[PDB]
């Protein structure tokens, strides 16, 4: 089982580095999604949002820093489609667009 646990650690680390996405557990059973590698001129600059699961099992965005004009609609869409992958990918794309506008 040592092989399996090792591989799980390795996978986490490779994903974090390659995707530029760190996932952090915080209080009240929430996860922070920290995107880096968004701003081509400041690859360590973070763009983040916080996710919870409500009492009915639904995804709930509890914070977004910097704010995104589209993330509330993305929450609606993930509740409707249950497509977590597309939800996260759309958020990442939105942060890239924002960084471009921030310049």
């Amino acid at each position: 089982t040592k092989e399996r646990v090792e591989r799980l650690c390795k996978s986490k680390e490779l994903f974090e580095e390659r995707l530029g996405l760190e996932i952090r557990r915080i209080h009240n059973e929430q996860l922070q999604f920290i995107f880096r590698h968004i701003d081509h001129k400041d690859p360590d600059k973070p763009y983040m949002f916080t996710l919870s699961i409500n009492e009915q099992g639904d995804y709930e965005v509890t914070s977004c820093t910097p704010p995104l004009d589209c993330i509330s609609e993305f929450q609606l869409k993930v509740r409707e489609t249950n497509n977590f992958s597309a939800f996260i990918a759309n958020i990442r794309k939105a942060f890239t667009a924002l960084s471009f506008k921030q310049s």
């Binding site: 590698h37 489609t81 497509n83 996260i88 990918a89 890239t96």
Partner: peptide, 22 residues
């Protein structure tokens, strides 16, 4: 080989694999 590629371009490349259609 990611050796001669920047971090941001590599991440953009890998995220390009993930569809956004919904």
């Amino acid at each position: 080989d990611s050796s001669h590629h920047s971090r941001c371009f590599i991440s953009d490349y890998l995220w390009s694999l993930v569809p956004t259609a919904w």
